[PDB]
Amino acid sequence: AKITIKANKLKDLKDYVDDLKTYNNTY
Amino acid sequence: YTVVKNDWKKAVKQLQDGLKNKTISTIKVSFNGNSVGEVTPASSGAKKADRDAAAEKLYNLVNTQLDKLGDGDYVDFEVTYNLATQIITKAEAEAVLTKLQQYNDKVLINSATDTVKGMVSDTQVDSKNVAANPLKVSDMYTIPSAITGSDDSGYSIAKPTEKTTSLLYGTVGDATAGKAITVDTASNEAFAGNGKVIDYNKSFKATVQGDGTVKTSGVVLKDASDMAATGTIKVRVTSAKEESIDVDSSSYISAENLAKKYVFNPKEVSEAYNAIVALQNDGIESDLVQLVNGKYQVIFYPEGKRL
């Protein structure tokens, strides 16, 4: 099922997705 | 037992059916772990109207909460059950009788021959065993023509009425007389549900005994299920906290905790990252970056759980 990340600010969405990419890549 | 939000109706339907058929005595309902009511048919579910009222009370209690469930909220049903107090409806009893009537003309024992035992007359010729007609189920049993019971207490099929035969069991050619054929009184029982089904392999069956005589069975029951007859079990309907990750709210699952939970497609995430960056700094629109209801959002489909 789909996951929807959202933020008022593009910068906060960027920081969350950046973190998600980093942690996804350490496995 | 745990189920996700999309399948709540069929979980609640299962609980409603158990209240109606007397297998469920009480249900405790709780939202996010906080007790929110108890559903209990009055007078131990004696009357059909009280059991139906319980099933409706449970649906009214939960249907709106389950329909708008999100945010990681959940609903628990703490269910006390007893599979043996099951009752069956008039239609369900009628269907079992319809099948049971198809056994009325089936043969229990064939006529005997020179080399295979079977039905033999009690009167001899030349002081020698002569064959008789086959022994049919209806020769030994009178299957009931109607179901009994009520809506309040459930319906049932009475035990088939037992009969006797003077025909015997032996071989053609035998100077020795045939052996007796007799109903097995311990293998003939009524059917009322009660967590049982009719065991058709063992029902309406002749069994040659160790001493040469024959016993016959009527209706023989077996358990409808392997699960335990009684207990208290908790059915939970869950919602996914990661469905809507709101980075501005006070409660959202962190990127690291999300990555502990789910493995993500590296291409899908890399392309979402690039579109956010290019929109933030360079003004390039992208279908990967929705702007809806004052919030920028992106969508991810995990490859699966991390194990």
Whether A11 sits inside 8 A of B294 (CB atoms) is no
Which of A14, A16, A19, A24 to substitute to test the interface with B, most B CBs within 10 Å?
A: A24
Whether A11 sits inside 8 A of B280 (CB atoms) is yes
Neighbours of B307 (CB within 10 A): 4
Q: Which of A4, A17, A22 is opposite residue B276, by nearest beta carbon?
A: A17
Closest residue, chain A, to B307 (C-alpha): A27
Neighbours of A6 (CB within 10 A): 24
Q: What H or E segment, with its residue span, contains residue A7?
A: strand A3-7
Resolution, angstroms, 1 dp: 2.4
Residue B240 at interface with chain A, using a CB cutoff of 8 Å:
yes
Neighbours of B75 (CB within 10 A): 25
Q: How were these coordinates obtained? A: X-ray
Contact B207, B214 (CB under 8 A): yes
Contact B112, B120 (CB under 8 A): yes
Q: What's the topology of domain B2-85+226-241? A: Dna Ligase; domain 1 (3.30.1490)
What is chain B written as a DSSP string?
Answer: -EEEGGGHHHHHHHHHHHHHTTSEEEEEEEETTEEEEEE--GGGG-SHHHHHHHHHHHHHHHHHHHHT--TT-EEEEEEEEEGGG--B-HHHHHHHHHHHHTTSS-EEEPBP-SSS-EEE-SS-SSSS--B---EEHHHHEE--SS-EEETTTEEEBPPPEE-----EEE-TT-SSPPBPEEE-TTS---B--TTEEE-TTTSS-EEE-TTS-EEE----EEES-SS-SEEEEEEEEE--GGGEEETTSS----HHHHHHHEE--HHHHHHHHHHHHHHHHH----TTSEEETTEEEEEE--SEE--
Q: Quote the tokens at residue B298.
A: 């992106």
Residue B261 at interface with chain A, using a CB cutoff of 8 Å:
no
* Domain regions of chain A by residue span: 1-27
* Domain regions of chain B by residue span: 2-85+226-241, 90-223, 255-305
> DSSP assignment, residue A13?
H
Contact B149, B200 (CB under 8 A): no
Q: What H or E segment, with its residue span, contains residue A5?
A: strand A3-7
Contact B112, B172 (CB under 8 A): yes
Residue B264 at interface with chain A, using a CB cutoff of 8 Å:
yes
Contact B295, A16 (CB under 8 A): no
CA angle B178, B183, B186 (to 5 degrees): 140
Contact B215, B182 (CB under 8 A): yes
Where does residue B6 rank: exposed (0-12), middle (13-18), buried (19+ CB within 10 A)?
exposed
